[PDB]
Amino acid sequence: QTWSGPGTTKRFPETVLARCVKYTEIHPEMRHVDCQSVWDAFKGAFISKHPCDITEEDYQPLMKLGTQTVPCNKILLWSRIKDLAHQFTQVQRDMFTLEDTLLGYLADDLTWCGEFDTSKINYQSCPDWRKDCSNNPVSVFWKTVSRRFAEAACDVVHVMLDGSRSKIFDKDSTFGSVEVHNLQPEKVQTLEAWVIHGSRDLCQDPTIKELESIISKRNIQFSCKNIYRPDKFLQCVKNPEDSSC
Ligand SMILES: Nc1nc2c(=O)n3cnc2n1[C@@H]1O[C@H](COP(=O)(O)OP(=O)(O)OC[C@H]2O[C@@H]3[C@H](O)[C@@H]2O)[C@@H](O)[C@H]1O
């Protein structure tokens, strides 16, 4: 193929449009959104543009339309453990991840790119962030929304981390390279990490100490908890202290 990454997801346009409709139906705060407009702004960011030359400015019309307030003190970040984060917030909406927002919901699990000097979508391949370029439509989208999500957070912010990874905290992740550096010291009191086990006290892991030290220097308190049994954890969230939770 031209590029090394997978092509635009089959039915991408129909899918984004349908997700926008469904989202705006469910969430009253976004009932004002015109979904065709959202789609046109989304398209505008990457159609007829070189897919290794995308900027955050390309996504500004979309950011504008998807403008949204979520409770700033109930934010859940995560790294390498998306599924658990999603299952947790779905129980009773204790917290909100980026996918609980319109823009995050539209884009989750999709890939897309265009081509320079033709107005079509590329269903054959899209740039891989490593081999091709990092300035590609998908990578640039997530960097942009994740920066914005972190900037809006306040009070106690939580992050779920995968304890089974080689680096439980990875400075190379979007959490580690973007979100950590965009939490606002004026607003964020504490970052609390939940390290999910797959054992030891993983909160004393070296990369966790690194995370602690980094956020301390931004003037933010750090807290850490082991979640030894994600299965029991979810059961306790669903059945709160009904049992021995
Ligand atoms: N679908 C999706 N939602 C995402 C999200 O909300 N965030 C980042 N990436 C996201 N993705 C895609 O999922 C893959 C894999 O992401 P990883 O497991 O390595 O974790 P990370 O890099 O630390 O990003 C998570 C972090 O940033 C925000 C979010 O708020 C969260 O706090 C990304 O490349 C992206 O294409």
Author numbering: 48 to 245, 250 to 296
Task: Give the original sentences from the paper that presented this experimental model.
Cyclic ADP-ribose (cADPR) is a second messenger that mobilizes intracellular Ca2+ in various types of cells including sea urchin eggs, T-cells and pancreatic β-cells. In biological systems, cADPR is synthesized enzymatically from nicotinamide adenine 5′-dinucleotide (NAD+) by the action of ADP-ribosyl cyclases. cADPR is readily hydrolyzed at the unstable N1 link to give ADP-ribose (ADPR) in both neutral aqueous solution and under physiological conditions, thus rendering chemical synthesis of non-hydrolyzable analogues attractive. Residue Glu-146 was identified as critical in regulating the multi-functionality of CD38-mediated NAD+ hydrolysis, ADP-ribosyl cyclase and cADPR hydrolysis activities. We report X-ray crystal structures of two non-hydrolyzable inhibitors in complex with wild-type CD38, one using an 8-substituted N1-cIDPR analogue derived from structure-based design considerations and another using a different hydrolysis resistant ligand, cADP carbocyclic ribose (cADPcR).
